[PDB]
Symmetry: D2
Subunit: 498 residues, 4 copies
């Protein structure tokens, strides 16, 4: 039982030497330089997130170029993620850059763009033109991470609502607006999003973090916007409203993976329900073996402080225990004072949680929920993980070209690294969102077809030695096809390192 | 499996009506007035914590008086806890009252009291005489609640260590010292702590939260200081350093309950290991059936902000899922801007976590770790809880004078309220740290001795109906003694409410 | 696991002192005398079976009278069971008392009663008048425990079939006939059966063993034949054909209990399938808590030998491990040379199997299959058994008037005796088919109403002492109602023997 | 749970097509002819047992020759087992060649060889010199295969016990003696046994069933007698008394396999304890993965009767459910009237029991008791079986030259056939005692060394198709070494049949 496992835990034992979970960092002013990015990589960053809520294409081009230069210097494969603006709603600007409200202040909010730059305490702009269709008298408008609420007193006209301010707040330029419980009808892919996604494809990004995904059909709209040239780019659907949570099964089935986007989610639904959504979404992703990312305010106070709070450490550890492949940083790295330190903390917390995880509970719970008969490659991958447990293997090695076989091994949650030898650089980069996987690139154009697998297996066993995963005489579990079969792995071998 | 449980969770279903977990609030300038306390109680405070690290006896007397007046006004039984200052190691003073250090600075730290009042960049005093035995070259000394760290380079003589400063910091007079991982030998009760415990006994406090408990012998020393007149006051031992963690079994044995005191703990041991200590300590307390409180920075940002961060919500939910009876607020209620709202959030999060808990998993895991044969009262209590699950009882009812039988039922983690009819007001107050229990006072001097239990059972069943735990025709599981057994309950009955 | 349990088994440990399983003995020439019956009772007989396939009412009256006299002498409550003839088919008599057949012998079998007494190798009688409707050319007639088969060559006329003998056999008077795979349409209650059952009621038998039960509706026909005066007599349905096995669920629901009647069953279905039927039927009875009896050839060779074969010992042990309440003897006691010894062997084997049974596997497997919410009396009885395990109780004590509460405790398979204090002698007798139960009669007409349960509880605790189940200072789990509730037990107490 | 499994069984569903368990038949006058042996083989005999307790070398040579001629005619590989006479204690002779005893008779038993030829009612000889050390006053001596029992009253001098006769019996010359529960010290190999083992080695028998193995040292003595030329012959140790049971772990360790020799065992230990020994020994053999045979009186009544009793059917089914690889026939085939029919019944019962077995329960229970880390070949074999369950493979295929890898796969109890391609005919014959395995011989002298395994794999897959284990498009799990590893299999593959 979990209780019996817990009472045997020790703070005095050595922790795992090899970190299984992965860290996604948002790039901004703190971290955009090649130097900064190198230090982030050294600190533990596996994926660079570009937040296309802000910044021009030129700004994000700099991010892309600098990430690639930093990664090339260090010899790493680092994923690059494009996080869409999506159907965001924001206020306009304010006369002065700031305005302050007390409870009972009556304020008009207008969709009329004449007011965009000249917001005051009496009247200001919101950039959602169908506002007065979406929110009725008696309804509420959440402003600025849901910190301030307005009650809609009346509809003055088609462009204007008269509102009652519920609480003290200092409102600044371009804050987020949420309208939970309203019929908000904005596209998953705006014209702006479409241009962003075409930019991502042109520049060869590895994955999209698609904002406010509500339905499977919206996932398909993102995939269509990516086009023929973008068909291998991962779509990670961000779940950040009620309808996304409701439609989670069909969204998971359509997507390559999921982000629990807790910022918007915890304004769209009652903040205390986010914990239940998180547990449920992560476990549903684990069961089907798709990567899942926990996001938002995980180490928030380290934006200004050199150490995290006790709740923040707990939050990161528990996301890992819940079963998340990745954990994410936003403002902590984009604009924080301690971007290297926050990533180093997050990496130490991941490792402690990984080391406090029962070896085989996930393996058995996940396997017990699969339909029998399995496909042969899934019978091979699940039984390979079982054999790694039985022999206490220090590493597994899998040949994967698309990533599929590495993700299938990772699904069964081994307690050792999964070295993936792959023939595609993009697979190297995309496998950064999958727990345990460490990628090695085999250039088949340069080195030959390797039909009998020997070159790639040697490359991975040499990597295992070099990286100090294992040494001579250790057993490694090696998964790939035999000499005939094409398209999937049908074979598992146990090999002693030479 | 936990995985299978998680994938079946819904954010859409109604949550439990009756909150099982309990909230400890620290009282301070935000909360000391009778009116503030009434609001805190309405918001969900069960125990008022006085932090005797600060404030005079006169200040805390006001808290005591105000808590009792507020509780009497609302007809509630509210626990009052005295949290001791405890032992401390501090620096001496510094010339000009401040000194600034930079990384790489080499500083001698001395236990020679000649240097107590004249610390410089070169050399300063620490008031712990065993320092050069406690910490070895290569070890660390932390200064100012962990903010500056020194590495010990060498021992110069039996009173002097040469140290390497790790980071920029400015020290002022008499800053706190922690010796992480080191065996420190300081009395359990200071002369200050004695006067404070004498005050607590005289004023009739319900429990002591005893700081920095390192051994079972220290618990016994606190117990001896409380003396004959304080023999019924609970001792809740605060685990704050590696010794407390290492000696946890014997400490739990000597104590009435445990606090996981994460503030000091996460300075004494690596911050990332606090999660592991927490899980281990909570589960150990569950297994023996003693109350355990999770403390410190749970909803910290609500000191200033009207909503918590996403990490904070998850910290509270996970402390409840871990198995904690109580969660605690410190500066959030003592000095924060939103003391009622923070308690209300904490209550709503507890309820969500409770509603997400698998009914019978804790019950079974706890029961499976008990030594067989049980004592008769524990067999009775554990089988009473089993019967509550089998019939879907809406409440249980137990007669307990000392609290012991109520805690024994709570140990088995029913999913319904445990109504405890007691003949002692202090037992009502003390049972506030125990999950699920709601107390009703039976005045035996007023109503008679009730040898056949019937008056007390009637009071309990009337209370269940009035407080809307159950109505006519519902089953309640009722635990007490038969007509001849004394000293413990040997009987369980299923009764339909008339 | 069972495997892990098995490898820990020892032949060198003491066995259980108190036998839980019960033995049903068939009475005949070996055992009908008062003396013989006393020795059978001393040896371990709990139920005397009268086989109404043979013998007149006067013969069976002698059995009834002699059982009662023997039981009165020894102060025992012994059940008396009436096992119906039912829809049996038999041959007639043969010229000489015997005839011998070789394979290929052509023989006519006739329904014409003119041939009843004068059977020869050429032609003989079968007492089923619709024979030539039931079995077609190409069909098979099984004769004499299915030892000899005839292929039906042709229908000579409405009274006569011409048959081909398949194997060597010596046929004697009045052997059984089976027609598996035929539509045989005989009543569950013939006119003969009706008179037998009215005799059973008039003479106060405890239970009917109803032969060849095919459907629930047939169980209801037996209950109707028993009439107003027979409404409390147990009906134990014997499962001995294909259709009985098919309809097992509805038959179990209609009956008080089941016998796996393996003699006919293993001719009606392929003999090797009987093992599967047995396991399935016994487990289905366990799940609903109705008594189940394993019958036929369990110790067959002891009919003539003073020791059983290795297969026979195994058979008895495995019936007990399968979960059977009772095991039965037929010819072994009815007509055997060693009736006392065979019962003594059967009792020793029962005890060894009981002692090799994992304490709690049955309890947990049975409980896990029950629907929640339970009725209160079933929550009480199941949790009482759990408390007996937790305290290692040496006995349980239940007040039961109908038997229902004793059977409900026995359903959960405690490892200690269940002392049942009952107000009806017939309940004492009927509880002999329920595992673990030992009955004590409380005569309420003589001793008083005992509303507060104290007289009956004292009677049972005194019995526990006298019979050496427990002694002073041992804990007993005592189940009955509190002072108000009527109709079922709502209370469990743990009591130390005074 | 087993309970839940049982309630879902149906007698109506089709049974397994391929029988997993194996049948050992004793050869005698009923079965010795080539034609009788061919029929036995067609009926399901896998191993022919020669009982060297009777018959000359010339007699057993005929069996050997006839078994080989019959097997060659049918193209089968049939194991030949030599079952030793073993050690024995006997009485001396009696005057007039017989003496009759009655209960209460007092008889002196002596180890003084003066009395060897002149035993009387007063005094007779037993040929075991340590008798007065082995058995103590109050102990028992059994005479004539347990039929008469004496209680030892007192020791008269160092060679004489005074005994009390318990039952009527007539002794003739040199009857067997058993000393139940007593430590007996007799050589493992008699001078007779030596000549018999020499004959077995010279004639090329596949296994020895070694009688009355009491210790591991005795197994080693048998192994040493077989010598260099018999080093590949299996030793199956027969457990026949309490010493064998007590020392079972070390005996299993020294042996190739175990027989539960229930005839002698149930004379040496109480008959009712044989069930407990059987379960324990079978499970212990399963856990280490060595073959275990259940023996003696399994279908005894079929010596004379054309159908078995109900107890006999259940004994066979339960030996299979217990986990036995093999079941054995003795007098049923050696001297019975229905040798083919008894083997055919035994096969049909095995198949029913197999079909009633929960697929994966044995697999999981066995795997969970193995010490971790496993050796690589055992991880490979156990994960191969796991993959067979996950894909519902219809067969497995293993290359094994010694038999070791085939036994290792069988240890994990797949539900399908295990095709073993071997390069040794003796390995084909020896694998007949191992559940599920069907052997095919690869002639490496004829077809080549097959370093890359391809010829052997082809032979195995062609065999699967031809014997209708699997057809085109079915998955088969294939276990052997990769192209460089020698000494053991390190590789498993899932292959679709072409
Ligand atoms: O790229 P994915 O879908 O993971 O499939 C990879 C698998 O396919 C195979 C066989 O086709 O690749 P490869 O041809 O590159 O050797 C296996 O060896 C390998 O394990
Ligand atoms: O006869 P059954 O149906 O078992 O019911 C017996 C139960 O009913 C009660 C209460 O009605 O009997 P009683 O009145 O004889 O005391 C319980 O005490 C007893 O356990
Ligand atoms: K965004
Ligand atoms: K304090
Ligand atoms: K009958
Ligand atoms: K022999
Ligand atoms: Mg968002
Ligand atoms: Mg502290
Ligand atoms: Mg019958
Ligand atoms: Mg023998």
């Amino acid at each position: 039982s979990q209780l019996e496992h817990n009472i045997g835990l020790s703070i005095f034992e050595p922790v795992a030497k090899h970190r299984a979970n992965r860290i996604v960092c948002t790039i901004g002013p703190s971290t955009q330089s090649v130097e900064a990015l190198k230090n982030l990589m050294k600190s533990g960053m596996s994926v660079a997130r570009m937040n296309f809520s802000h910044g021009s294409h030129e700004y994000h081009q700099t991010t892309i170029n600098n990430v690639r230069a930093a990664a090339a210097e260090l010899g790493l494969h680092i994923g690059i993620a494009l996080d869409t603006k999506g159907p965001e709603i924001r206020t306009g600007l304010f006369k002065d850059g700031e305005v302050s409200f007390a409870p009972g202040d009556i304020v008009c909010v207008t969709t009329d763009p004449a007011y965009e730059k000249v917001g005051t305490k009496e009247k200001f702009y919101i950039d959602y033109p169908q506002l007065t269709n979406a929110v009725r008298p008696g309804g509420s408008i959440y402003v600025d991470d849901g910190v301030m609420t307005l009650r809609v007193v009346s509809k003055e006209d088609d462009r204007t609502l008269k509102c009652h301010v519920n609480n003290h707040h200092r409102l600044t330029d371009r804050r987020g607006i949420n309208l939970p419980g309203c019929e908000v009808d904005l596209p998953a892919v705006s014209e702006k999003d479409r241009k962003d996604l075409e930019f991502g494809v042109a520049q060869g990004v590895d994955m999209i973090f698609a904002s406010f995904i509500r339905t499977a059909e919206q996932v398909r709209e993102v995939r269509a916007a990516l086009g023929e040239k973008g068909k291998d780019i991962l779509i990670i659907s961000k779940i950040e409203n009620h309808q996304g949570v409701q439609n989670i099964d069909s969204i998971i089935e359509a997507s390559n993976g999921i982000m629990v986007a807790r910022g918007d989610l915890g304004v769209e639904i009652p903040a205390e329900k986010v914990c239940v959504a998180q547990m449920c979404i992560i476990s549903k992703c684990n069961v089907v073996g798709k990567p899942v990312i926990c996001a938002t305010q995980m180490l928030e106070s380290m934006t200004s402080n050199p150490r995290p709070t006790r709740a923040e450490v707990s939050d990161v550890a528990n996301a890992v225990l819940n079963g998340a492949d990745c954990v994410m940083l936003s403002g902590e790295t984009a604009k924080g004072k301690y971007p290297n330190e926050v990533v180093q903390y997050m990496a130490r917390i991941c490792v402690e949680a990984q080391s406090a995880t029962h070896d085989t509970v996930m393996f058995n719970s996940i396997k017990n929920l699969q339909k029998i008969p399995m496909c042969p490659e899934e019978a091979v991958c699940s039984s390979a993980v079982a054999s790694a447990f039985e022999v206490q293997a220090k590493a597994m090695l899998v040949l994967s070209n698309t990533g599929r076989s590495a993700r299938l091994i990772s699904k069964y949650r081994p307690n050792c690294p999964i070295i993936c030898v792959t023939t595609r650089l993009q697979t190297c980069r995309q496998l950064n969102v999958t727990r345990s996987v460490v990628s090695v690139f085999y250039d088949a154009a340069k080195s030959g077809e390797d039909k009998d697998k020997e070159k790639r297996v040697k490359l991975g066993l040499d990597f295992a030695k070099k990286e100090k995963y294992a040494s001579t005489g250790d057993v490694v579990v090696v998964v790939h096809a035999d000499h005939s079969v094409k398209g999937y792995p049908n074979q598992t071998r146990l090999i002693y390192l030479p």
